[PDB]
Amino acid sequence: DASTKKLSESLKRIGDELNSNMELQRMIAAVDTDSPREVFFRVAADMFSDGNFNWGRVVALFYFASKLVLKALS
Amino acid sequence: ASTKKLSESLKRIGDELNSNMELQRMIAAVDTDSPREVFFRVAADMFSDGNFNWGRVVALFYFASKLVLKALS
């Protein structure tokens, strides 16, 4: 009931925070199409060198990865 | 060079969501003997407002992956 509602609202906020960040969309679009994997792994590694890797960062990483995949298929 | 500012953006957004919600505690607390319909209940409410953005699709796949990993444990 309220448990699955708070969970769905939380997942809505996660998706909306990623999709509405106009700055992030510009940086992802500015990634050069010659080497997307290098950029993705360089970004994924900076997520660990901090020491505080968390679920928020893997959801952001997979958003970035999916946007990169969509970009190459387009 | 500009990869740094992109990593900073992805780190900041990721850390802001982490500090804002206890998502892992929420996912772990859902019913384990009812996997298919807890996914559809969440997926239906996520799109009840007519907003089908790609960010929500990613958020739904992460929730689905956390669901099957719990079911396989």
Residue of A nearest to B56 (CA): A15
Kindly compute the dihedral angle of the four CA atoms of residues A47, A51, A56, A61, in this order, to the nearest 10 degrees: 20
Query: For chain A, first and last CA: distance in Å?
Result: 40
Q: What count of other Cβ atoms lies within 10 Å of the Cβ of residue A34?
A: 7
Give me A62's structure tokens.
């997979």
Query: For chain B, first and last CA: distance in Å?
Result: 42
Q: Do the chains contact at B3 and A56, CB–CB below 8 Å?
A: no
- Helix runs in chain B, H state only: 2-20, 23-29, 35-46, 54-71
Calculate the CA A53 to chain-centre distance: 14
Contacts with A57 from chain B: Cβ below 8 Å: 10-11, 14-15, 18
| Separation CA B3–CA A41 (nearest Å) | 11
Domains and CATH numbers, chain A: 2-73 (1.10.437.10)
